Amino acid sequence: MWELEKDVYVVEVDWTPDAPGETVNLTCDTPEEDDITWTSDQRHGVIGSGKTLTITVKEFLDAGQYTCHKGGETLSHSHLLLHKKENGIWSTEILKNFKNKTFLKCEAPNYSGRFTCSWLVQRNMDLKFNIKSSSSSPDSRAVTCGMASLSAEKVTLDQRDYEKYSVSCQEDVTCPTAEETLPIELALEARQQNKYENYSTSFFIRDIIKPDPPKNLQMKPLKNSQVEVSWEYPDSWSTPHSYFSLKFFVRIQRKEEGCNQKGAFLVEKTSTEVQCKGGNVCVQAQDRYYNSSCSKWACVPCRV
Amino acid sequence: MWELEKDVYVVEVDWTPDAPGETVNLTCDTPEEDDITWTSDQRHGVIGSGKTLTITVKEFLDAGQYTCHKGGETLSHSHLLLHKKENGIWSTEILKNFKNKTFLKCEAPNYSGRFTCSWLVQRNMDLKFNIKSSSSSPDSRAVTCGMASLSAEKVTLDQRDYEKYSVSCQEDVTCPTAEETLPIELALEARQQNKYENYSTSFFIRDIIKPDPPKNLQMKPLKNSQVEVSWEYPDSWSTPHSYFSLKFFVRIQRKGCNQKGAFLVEKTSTEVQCKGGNVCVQAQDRYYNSSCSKWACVPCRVRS
Ligand SMILES: *[C@@H]1O[C@H](CO)[C@@H](O[C@@H]2O[C@H](CO)[C@@H](O[C@@H]3O[C@H](CO)[C@@H](O)[C@H](O[C@H]4O[C@H](CO)[C@@H](O)[C@H](O)[C@@H]4O)[C@@H]3O)[C@H](O)[C@H]2NC(C)=O)[C@H](O)[C@H]1NC(C)=O
Numbered sequence A: 001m002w003e004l005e006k007d008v009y010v011v012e013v014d015w016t017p018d019a020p021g022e023t024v025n026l027t028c029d030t031p032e033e034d035d036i037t038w039t040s041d042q043r044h045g046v047i048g049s050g051k052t053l054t055i056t057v058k059e060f061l062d063a064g065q066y067t068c069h070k071g072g073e074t075l076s077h078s079h080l081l082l083h084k085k086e087n088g089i090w091s092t093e094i095l096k097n098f099k100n101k102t103f104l105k106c107e108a109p110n111y112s113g114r115f116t117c118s119w120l121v122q123r124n125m126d127l128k129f130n131i132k133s134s135s136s137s138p139d140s141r142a143v144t145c146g147m148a149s150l151s152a153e154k155v156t157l158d159q160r161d162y163e164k165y166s167v168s169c170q171e172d173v174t175c176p177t178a179e180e181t182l183p184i185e186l187a188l189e190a191r192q193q194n195k196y197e198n199y200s201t202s203f204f205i206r207d208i209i210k211p212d213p214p215k216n217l218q219m220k221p222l223k224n225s226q227v228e229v230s231w232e233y234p235d236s237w238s239t240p241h242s243y244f245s246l247k248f249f250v251r252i253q254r255k256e257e258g259c260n261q262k263g264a265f266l267v268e269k270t271s272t273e274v275q276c277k278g279g280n281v282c283v284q285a286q287d288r289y290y291n292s293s294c295s296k297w298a299c300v301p302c303r304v
Numbered sequence B: 001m002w003e004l005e006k007d008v009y010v011v012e013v014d015w016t017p018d019a020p021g022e023t024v025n026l027t028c029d030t031p032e033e034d035d036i037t038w039t040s041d042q043r044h045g046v047i048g049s050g051k052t053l054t055i056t057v058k059e060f061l062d063a064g065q066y067t068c069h070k071g072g073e074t075l076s077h078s079h080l081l082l083h084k085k086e087n088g089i090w091s092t093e094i095l096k097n098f099k100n101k102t103f104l105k106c107e108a109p110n111y112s113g114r115f116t117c118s119w120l121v122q123r124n125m126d127l128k129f130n131i132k133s134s135s136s137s138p139d140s141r142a143v144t145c146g147m148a149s150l151s152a153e154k155v156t157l158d159q160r161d162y163e164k165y166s167v168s169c170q171e172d173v174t175c176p177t178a179e180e181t182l183p184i185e186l187a188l189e190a191r192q193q194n195k196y197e198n199y200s201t202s203f204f205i206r207d208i209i210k211p212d213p214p215k216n217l218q219m220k221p222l223k224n225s226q227v228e229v230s231w232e233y234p235d236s237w238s239t240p241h242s243y244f245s246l247k248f249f250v251r252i253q254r255k256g257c258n259q260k261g262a263f264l265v266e267k268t269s270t271e272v273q274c275k276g277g278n279v280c281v282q283a284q285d286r287y288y289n290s291s292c293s294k295w296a297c298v299p300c301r302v303r304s
């Protein structure tokens, strides 16, 4: 048993079928000692007595809020959370992994030290999340994160619409020309009802760059069914663009979201000419000097 | 009255003509009390007695070093400095202001956090100066400065000459790529004879950038009296040059920033048809309107 926060404790439980339950002690936070009784939110009635309650936990019926009483009034409480370790493996059952088998996915629109992380949930009910820098050893990259929020847009995986939570984080110190010698290490704590799980990921900002889609995409007609297509760097992108430069990929649609999923032609300039004479013209952007993630496609019609 | 350094005190004297003089107390630093007499370096003979001397100061004849004695030997001394406040305005009479109302001007050759400040003096006699970071609060930009020295270069303002002092400073912790959200604040303490003044300035490194003139400026003659002029970024300029880039201005002379007609090049070489004049180039930060470099010039020669 280890304390997670004041009066909230995590009990690590071996979930192999013949495993003995862990014995824990709970102490009423009071100066008095006599005639103290205990109750539980899982069990009707009085389940014990004395200043210190010793119980054996193996199932989630042994978890939850425990409250000590004297004379009919409340004294204090402790809440027990369970962390399953089955076959030596901590449980990962709260979150749904993405198509690649990762639970945490992080993206940065630029090199300013701001990034977001997201995850999917198997059930969206009675959930709490906390994300913070892990290890906190010297020379660790300190990161400040906000609170997780629920996206209205759900993420379809196979045949189910999983709900997605995401959180924004900021590196406390940046020096953006400097090379990253150590990764950023983060941990997500996930709670659902009386279950505790936690997740970790580590990365460099250069790896998770996903620029915003190109802006102000326009069409100007030319002789011989040629059209000029032009766009600009997105406003979220790091400046100066002479140093932080983007390369673009242009695609024609006659009528699958990650860089190489479509055949297309490469241009490093913000404009090209193309002969569509019908359909759509799409463009995505990537960092020019590092093979980071690509932007979403920006598309405009080829008017006929 | 306040203490500037050990045994050196600053007295704030109102210099309006009918103002009363400040009464100040001086205490002899000794374990003895009887038969203590006082003398001054402005006033020969015994001017008082007792462990504590009370004097009234209004003029510089009431200033300088005061020394207590017992038995004909020195015991301790105190020095009095006067800070004039006339019409409610602190006196600024030690230094001469520049082209604008400022008395302090600072310049940096690059973004490394090392910079120099200079000031002018009305008279070079009995001068001492001290310059340090202002406030030095949390969230202040801590700066370490050296000792002031007399520069060999004298300057001319109006039709009169003034002598120049200069000092080198270094920011203690610098990321040169980061944007400056707060200025550097400095205070100069100026002393001349028994007179105290002090001056303050605030600036951003980006505002005081004056790059060195382009290096290795050379001229290569070509056929038909065209010549190629080329140069390099100066060795003092911040790197990488892909991030810290300079724009240049090339001028032709038959015989500083925006006083001359010249043509702009961002690359380090141009071709020019001068047949015998001079070709000059200056440099300026490409993305910020900082001060411009001194002109570097090369004679134009017709051959090849
Ligand atoms: C991810 O999940 C794992 C599994 O739960 C988790 O590991 C647990 O971490 C806690 C500490 O955060 C460990 O509990 C400690 O154990 C040591 C050794 O026995 C004790 O010294 C500690 O007690 C001290 O601190 C307590 C709290 O202040 C005090 O009550 C006490 O008096 C001591 O001062 C404490 O009990 C626990 O052993 C590990 N378990 C394992 C097997 O790793 C990990 O922290 C999670 N990661 C993140 C980033 O949340």
Ligand SMILES: *[C@@H]1O[C@H](CO)[C@@H](O[C@@H]2O[C@H](CO)[C@@H](O[C@@H]3O[C@H](CO)[C@@H](O)[C@H](O[C@H]4O[C@H](CO)[C@@H](O)[C@H](O)[C@@H]4O)[C@@H]3O)[C@H](O)[C@H]2NC(C)=O)[C@H](O)[C@H]1NC(C)=O
Residues within 6 Å of the ligand: B001, B002, B003, B010, B012, B083, B187, B189, B198
């Ligand atoms: C620029 O010049 C101005 C004008 O001379 C100057 O202002 C003066 O600053 C001094 C130093 O802060 C002030 O003198 C102090 O008065 C306060 C009143 O609250 C006292 O607390 C101070 O006492 C100190 O020393 C005592 C004895 O050791 C300690 O017991 C005590 O805790 C303090 O440490 C001290 O007497 C003075 O009042 C102002 N005058 C004004 C308001 O003009 C300014 O500081 C100069 N700036 C720089 C950067 O030099």
